[PDB]
Write a protein that binds this ligand. Sequence first.
Ligand SMILES: [Cl-]
Ligand SMILES: [Cl-]
Ligand SMILES: [Cl-]
Length: 129
Amino acid sequence: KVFGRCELAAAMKRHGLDNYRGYSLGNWVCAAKFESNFNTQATNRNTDGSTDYGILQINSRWWCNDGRTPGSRNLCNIPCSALLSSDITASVNCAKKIVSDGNGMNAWVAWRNRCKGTDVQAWIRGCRL
Ligand SMILES: [Cl-]
Ligand SMILES: [Cl-]
Ligand SMILES: [Cl-]
């Protein structure tokens, strides 16, 4: 599913991401924009043999199991395919664990490079939230 911007904002808010670990909703929308372009089916291979999955490009070395990644820990206890669903519940639950792991949203390199420090509230402009 390719979410609309405000559609994703509303889903993220409903699932409790607005201000989760102190990160406003616009931070999460911005991250998803640059991680996946709002496409739940996005996948991207990394050099270490892991793959990133879903709306927030969650990695198969630490977080989800894809059956082919060296050193896999499956800390979210979920198949990586669950992170491609049209329903973002599994991605949100896992993202909550990731953002709590110590480095906050810097865990998402694209957030650090493209969202951190910017006017992230722009990402929720116009939405009825
Ligand atoms: Cl915001
Ligand atoms: Cl959803
Ligand atoms: Cl933090």
